């Protein structure tokens, strides 16, 4: 368990694992992670904008 590089995982059968809760945005102490949420026109609630700037973020 090591932290250094930000990468978002997905399910074994495709499909983006992230849900756009903005939970990770609120906990973020640097306020680095920016998130805009939208419905994907097919019921599921997922992401549109997802910028985690490395100018900020203290890992």
Partner 1 sequence: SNLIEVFVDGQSVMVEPGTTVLQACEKVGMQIPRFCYHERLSVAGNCRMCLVEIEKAPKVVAACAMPVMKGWNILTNSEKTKKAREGVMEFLLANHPLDCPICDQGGECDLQDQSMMFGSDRSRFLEGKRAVEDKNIGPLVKTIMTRCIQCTRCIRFASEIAGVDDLGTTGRGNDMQVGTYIEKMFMSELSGNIIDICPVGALTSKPYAFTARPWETRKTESIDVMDAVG
Partner 2 sequence: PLMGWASTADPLSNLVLTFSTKEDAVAFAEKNGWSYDVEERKVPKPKSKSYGANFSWNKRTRVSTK
Partner 3 sequence: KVDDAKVSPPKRAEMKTSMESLIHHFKLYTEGYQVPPGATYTAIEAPKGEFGVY
Q: Taking the CA atoms of 18, 23, 27 and 33 in sequence, report the sign of the dihedral they define.
A: positive
The footprint of ligand SF4 on residues 1-59 (CB under 6 A) is 18-24
Is residue 38 a contact point for partner 2 (CB under 8 A)? no
Instruction: Please give the Cα distance from 20 to 29 (Å, whole number).
Output: 18
30 belongs to an annotated ligand binding site: no
Residue whose CB is less far from partner 1, 8 or 21: 21
Q: Which two tokens stand for residue 22?
A: 């903005």
18 is in an annotated binding site: yes
Residues near ligand SF4 (CB under 6 A): 18-24
């Amino acid at each position: 368990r090591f932290r250094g590089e930000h990468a978002l995982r997905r399910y074994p059968s495709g499909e983006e694992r992230c849900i756009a809760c903005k939970l990770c945005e609120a906990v973020c102490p640097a306020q680095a992670i920016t998130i805009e949420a939208e419905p994907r026109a097919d019921g599921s609630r997922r992401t549109t904008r997802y910028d985690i700037d490395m100018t900020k973020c203290i890992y």
